[PDB]
Write a protein that binds this ligand. Structure first.
Ligand SMILES: CCN1CCC(Nc2ccccc2F)CC1
Length: 284
């Protein structure tokens, strides 16, 4: 019974290798990866793969792997799919640990923009979690941490991490990770999946998908936000994506709002992530 080798990049940067039957649904591989990670609160996570256009796609656990990766390698990443708006409500510390690992990559990558002071505070909690109480013996005036804290490291940032790390004496790893998450969850781009688009006039915009709803980023002064309950239908057609808005109070007609995506694949991808978010955050 023929099996395909799968390679999964984990959130710590290491590689997990396993075999699944070649006609396996995504759930088979995801279950193996979550068992490897000792992860029970699996609903927030997913696997990604790169399509023939090198775009990130979620592996649908309900569909055959072979019908998603198609002609590409069986190579995946383990990622947070649904960012909990309140990580304190998660039942296990280990779930919060994986969510911290994802957010550290979101920060270093620049997907999650962050002030100097918040970069330093987040860094200080990671250092406290992983090394424990501050020790001057490992850091003179010229200390640089092996830890990656930011898209661009400066001596000033390193110095501020150390100053805040000193303040965390006695803090345990779960406690430090919770403080990490209490800060990160407040960031304006926390858990926002961004998609390049044009408005119905051809003006370049960004669509953000998140727990609360759909964001349109237009000209810096114009951000429009559509809470999920205001959204009755998500649809795509060719390179176009549309949202059907509930009729407002005393309004006779629903309204549909339309956007242009880079290509058909990008419109279908944005539709699927919106539907998934709407379903997940309707139930959570
Ligand atoms: C603080 C983290 N997060 C930032 C994006 C914001 N998005 C949003 C707000 C209201 C309605 C629809 C929306 F998409 C939700 C909170």
């Amino acid at each position: 019974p023929k099996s395909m080798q799968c390679k999964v990049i984990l959130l710590d940067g290491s590689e997990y290798t396993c075999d699944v039957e070649k006609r396996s649904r995504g759930q088979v591989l995801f279950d193996k990866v979550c068992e490897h990670l000792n992860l029970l609160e699996k609903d927030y996570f997913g696997l990604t793969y790169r399509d023939a256009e090198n775009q990130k796609n979620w592996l649908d656990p309900a569909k055959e792997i072979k019908k998603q990766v198609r002609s590409g390698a069986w190579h995946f990443s383990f990622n947070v799919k649904f960012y909990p708006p309140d990580p304190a409500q998660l039942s296990e510390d280990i779930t919060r640990y994986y969510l911290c690992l994802q957010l550290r990559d979101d920060i270093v990558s620049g997907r999650l923009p962050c002030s100097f002071v918040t970069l330093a505070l987040l860094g200080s909690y990671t250092v406290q979690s992983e090394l424990g109480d501050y020790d001057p013996d490992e850091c003179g005036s010229d200390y640089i941490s092996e830890f990656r804290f930011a898209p661009n490291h400066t001596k000033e940032l390193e110095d501020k991490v150390i100053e805040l790390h000193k303040s965390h004496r006695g803090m345990t790893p779960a406690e430090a990770e919770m403080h990490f998450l209490e800060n990160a969850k407040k960031l304006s781009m926390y858990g926002v999946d961004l998609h390049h688009a044009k408005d119905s006039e051809g003006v370049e915009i960004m669509l953000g998908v998140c727990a609360s709803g759909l964001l349109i980023y237009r000209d810096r002064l114009r951000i429009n936000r559509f809470a999920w309950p205001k959204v009755l239908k998500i649809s795509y057609k060719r390179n176009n994506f549309y949202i059907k808005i509930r009729p407002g109070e005393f309004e006779q007609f629903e309204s549909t709002i339309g956007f242009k995506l880079p290509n058909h694949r990008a419109a279908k991808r944005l539709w699927k992530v919106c539907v998934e978010h709407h379903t997940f955050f309707r139930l959570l």
